[PDB]
């Protein structure tokens, strides 16, 4: 039974959020697509990318190395679909801007646009961790950009509560 999401809070007609770890969710939900928050060389570091890769026993990194050897690096805001291995049917690797290095935060719109090629996705908040974007800003861009069904896994309970509170204020406009 694929895409068996449960316990999400509905934010908009197509964006849902849950205080959960993205790997544990993938194991529970068996999603068609899980989203990786990637860099342009698909060298999977210490955030979601490392978590997903470790859960595939490094199969994600070997596949990514093979992709890069054939195709070269991605562009910021770009994506590629590879295997989801034991976690999902497919993994959508998306490159958000690295705001810590001064890349353009507006490319987060381009990054989330990639979600619109998939009916339903399990995803993290792009650029909001190692890449240093404000998590509330990443959620705002997600809500304004994605039209397909996005289930957001936010593992930190304090961040989750902060995101919901900030989302409500922006939506009500006070
Ligand atoms: N296991 C997890 N489950 C859910 N959310 C998570 C998890 N780990 C981190 N997060 C949260 O998801 C958001 C995404 O953070 P990152 O994974 O660091 O993604 P990003 O900010 O885009 O940085 C990308 C960079 O990090 C490396 O892992 C990756 O190879 C790339 O270079 C952050 O809010 C982070 O706290
Ligand atoms: Na929750």
Numbering used by the authors: 206 to 379
Paper text:
In order to identify how sequence alterations affect the structure and substrate recognition of S2-MacroD, we solved its protein structure in the presence of the reaction product ADP-ribose (ADPr) by X-ray crystallography. S2-MacroD2:ADPr crystallized in P212121 with two ligand-bound molecules in the asymmetric unit and was refined to a resolution of 1.57 Å. The resulting structure of S2-MacroD:ADPr follows the previously observed fold of a tightly packed α/β/α sandwich with a central six-stranded, mixed β-sheet flanked by six α-helices. The ADPr ligand lies within a deep cleft on the crest of the domain. The two protomers deviate only slightly from each other (r.m.s.d. of 0.091 Å over 149 Cα). The adenosine moiety lies parallel to the protein surface and is partially shielded by Phe360, which interacts edge-to-face with the aromatic ring system. The amino group at the C6 position is interacting with Asp226. The phosphodiester is interacting with several backbone amide groups within a loop region spanning the edge of the binding cleft (Ser332 to Phe336), which was therefore termed the pyrophosphate binding loop. Two characteristic motifs contribute further to the coordination of the distal ribose, first, the NAAN motif (Asn241 to Asn244 in S2-MacroD) lines the floor of the binding cleft and Asn244 coordinates both the 2″ and 3″OH moieties of the distal ribose. Second, a triple glycine stretch makes further contacts to the 1″ and 2″OH positions via the backbone amide group of Gly252 and Gly250, respectively.
